[PDB]
Design a protein around this nucleic acid. Structure first.
Lengths: 313, 311, 312, 316
DNA sequence: AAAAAAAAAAAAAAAAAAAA
DNA sequence: AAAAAAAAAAAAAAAAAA
């Protein structure tokens, strides 16, 4: 009925949170996904330490983490999630042992082990996507102090190393900065900061975001952009005739590509980083694909977070 | 009627330095503050050894410090401070034992011990504020060699770990950099290199800095900024009749809003450094007796401005 | 004509019959590419590159070897048709896979040595033609590998054989590696903008010169590429009704270029350019004309964008 | 008679190059030092391969290196250096095995092994210094294409990873770039680009560069600066009364102390990486000074405003 | 505000520790 | 000048690699 990824995510969430997992709230799904991701990187207290090439301080931190008691059952997580007594069984069963690699499992040849590893990787990917989406949603109302210049804002979102490894094409941060600065291999992916990510309640059902869906302005905006993208993207929403909290998606932005403006030095010339302004820099236009067709909407010239705050005024 | 914070420091300084402690000389107050800070941090000779996890060299240094003869009455600390015979009693009775933690003091329930611990903590905060002000004052005429590039200049003042542990919001340095390069949370504080610190002679008596109070140019400049800040801040000081190295404050700069107005390039649009928006035309907001005014930046560091205007 | 061009002309004739037009850039480029593939044993039914090939590479080489070879009359490009003689040529002139000049020299066979030298010259000519075609293509559509000036510095990006044949002109990954290798007498500096006559001029030894009828795109490709400065367009003047034909009025200098930086040291201030001391869009290029060198102000836009705007 | 480092370098060069090692030429000493460095890093053909964490291409390259025959006795290196028949014995004896670490040897406790490891470390450092000096000397007459902007020139000289590991305080390149960009630990060292490196003929003798020494202009300049440094440094040379090709050193430049023209942002203002440049002035830039310590005393010499390489070319 | 908690008597170059 | 060597055929998601 559903692909492997969504099926495994639903199974894991149901097993670990029992009946307390709501399937129609973005925050609850996000909390469940974040908790599950924590459960799969060997980061929770009482899990195997990371000491392969750990510095003395890292050795101490990992030893302290290992010594500390693991989370107990019946524990409240997030706002409306309560662990079930059988979460330990799922953790012991479906969680690969620390250091597990696909090469070793394939050499062993165990079909069950291979399937469990595939499910683990798929759940990692789905939870990383949900966590990036929730990061976008948070940035729509609460600015991050770390981001202070376009040079820093270029690497948003800031996420842990395992998050970068799972989805290098979507997750930025320190690891993405190092990868971009270092040698670029065959597996290098450029940080597609504004990739489309369906909301949590759709990302676990497979219903791809599209026109006609009934969604809130904040959730749609965090899906298609983040806190510091231009406010013109707000045009992609239309309030409904009812309460107005949940509207309808009318159109989605289109990703422009190409058209480099560099001019390499030759015959005694000097390089030009950008050939280009004020009039076009301010107004500008963005291509929004609607049901009727593509429309060029002039950019509002302001941050999305500022636009949302002003509208809330 | 001074707050307990300043009362504790005044009493300690009196007990430790007799009449030699002048409450009107900034250098003397600073020397006494540093002395009290090193005493209450267990760094004076003959004090307990920091050998909880000391390395070989650090273990040897701590053992030598413990073995070394402790300071005696009549010792000269600075230029115009002399220890008294009561300093030994003050250290024995007021300084908490090495490694003492407020958890154990609260668990014991002794009200006197809790009061002593609170007094020690407040005294450390006061002495750290005074030390930060002294670092700002010194850097107005002689810059730290560790400051070579904007990255290094972003972390002034460079004070030891204990100082940062006392007032995280003011002291920069290696520990501030480490905290910056580590985890962040509610308990995390931001280094405010230009947070207003009243001068020592004004700090220990509770007098807040305000327009119209007699101060020196260096005093105000260190009390509102440091050596490498834009020279425009010098406008906050105006000499009196005949100057005489003493003037008056005419304003106090306002702080910058932390709101970020960036708009990152996306979907083909062009990135904007400031949605609201020349470099030498920027203005600072000064709160004067009348109201807020805008003063154009000078473009030169206070250190260089003082060097050039010295003669 | 020099043997370097004579070998290419003879091979092209023997392979393509009379269909090999010698006055069209596209036809010559297609023929050169086909000959380069033939002499690299990259065609169907040719040898297999299995010295150290990995499992998948080994399998693909085996499949290519087993795959049927091209037959006479095959249509290559748009206006080139193979001749039955080509096989014989491919049987004789093409060196066996893995043959090294050391073994040929040790053998002492004069015929084999001459064949190897002819093969090397043919490879050099084919690589030059491929570089010109790459510039021509880049003049309309840009490769995505070039996003920053650092990546643009190594254009064109060609295989290792291309760099080996003509290290002076070809760049790519192998040129990047050689830059980090070491410096010596054999070391040749990359010249991204060397004057290469169009294929219709190269195979006949028609060195580009002022007064030669050439298309604007032809001249731009032969003396520049897509991302160069648009001011180079000053070197071409149209004719009656243009009609994609004009004339060369001048050529840019060979563009040696020296670095005039002065890095800060011992407290002195860094200088980004020694000459400028005492404006970014005011820079000018030197063009040698029939009369003398002239300074032409830069346009500030890449040649690609200039051409795109001119088209529409 | 001489420190440990110079003694071990002389011993190694004498053992490896026999009597063909000319002790009074810069180029010959540089070639010998570079060859010793390559031998001691296990990069000569016929030495252990580096495969601990090697990528497939690196594995192939190292396997090819291992398979190839090692250099034979009498092979010509550089210009006037010929290997002796006993170089293989020295390479096998004095070169620590690939992956050798000082911790393992210290745990073993073998005095001979510890001494050999210390000698290898010292020779690595001396050869790195010689090769850095030679890179400078080459930059005085042959520009580098890699250096197109001040950002790139900030990392000169470029050298291999082991070269950076041996002498982080002088060697730049990719590895210094990575260290600076990444976390800065307790062992981090800034690139002292223009440190004073006595010529290789003195660097192997211990005669520190100082006033009164007879040296060429090119060698002295490469010792106290590199290709793109300011031209005023040429004032540190005084042509002799004879031919004038080879002169004497009068004074050495002093690493400036006091230039802190930064202006950090505060109260909404913006940082200034350098006051003079942002001042939009040229008068100061043409009237700078450099503090040359001479025999009589310190002197302030006005900067010539042109690259050292260009000044050398124009003089010739 | 309450809580929690490394050659300018004392800040470059070379050495022993650590390790394109 | 020589030697040494979703615009029949260019993003998103999956199985390979990590």
């Amino acid at each position: 009925e559903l692909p492997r990824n969504l099926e495994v995510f639903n199974e894991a969430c149901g097993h670990v949170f029992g009946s307390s997992f709501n399937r129609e709230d973005n925050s609850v799904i996000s909390d469940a996904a974040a908790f599950l991701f924590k459960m799969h990187t060997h980061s929770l207290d009482g899990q195997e330490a990371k000491v392969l090439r750990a510095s003395e301080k890292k050795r101490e931190r990992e030893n302290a983490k290992k010594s500390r008691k693991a989370p107990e059952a019946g524990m409240r997580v997030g706002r409306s999630l309560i662990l079930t007594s059988r979460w330990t069984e799922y953790c012991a069963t479906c969680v690969p042992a620390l250091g597990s690699k696909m090469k070793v499992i394939k050499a062993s040849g165990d079909a069950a082990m291979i399937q469990m590893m595939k499910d683990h990787n798929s759940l990692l990917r789905v939870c990383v996507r949900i966590e990036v989406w929730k990061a976008r949603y948070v940035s729509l109302v609460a600015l991050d102090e770390r981001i202070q210049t376009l040079e820093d804002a270029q690497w948003f979102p800031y996420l842990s190393g395992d998050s970068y490894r799972a989805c290098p094409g979507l997750v930025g941060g320190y690891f993405a900065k190092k990868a971009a600065a270092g040698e670029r291999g065959k597996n290098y992916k450029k940080l597609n900061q504004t990739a489309i990510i369906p909301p949590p309640r759709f990302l676990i059902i497979g219903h791809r975001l599209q026109i006609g869906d009934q969604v809130t302005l904040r959730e749609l905006l965090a899906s298609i952009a983040w806190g510091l993208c231009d406010g013109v993207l707000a045009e992609c929403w239309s309030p409904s005739q009812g309460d107005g909290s949940i509207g309808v998606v009318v159109g989605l932005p289109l990703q422009a590509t190409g058209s480099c403006f560099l001019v390499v030095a030759s015959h005694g010339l000097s390089a030009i980083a950008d050939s280009r302004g004020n009039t076009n820099l301010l107004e500008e236009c963005i291509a929004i694909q609607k049901q009727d067709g593509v429309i060029k909407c002039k950019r509002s010239g302001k941050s999305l977070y500022h636009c949302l705050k002003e509208t809330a005024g």
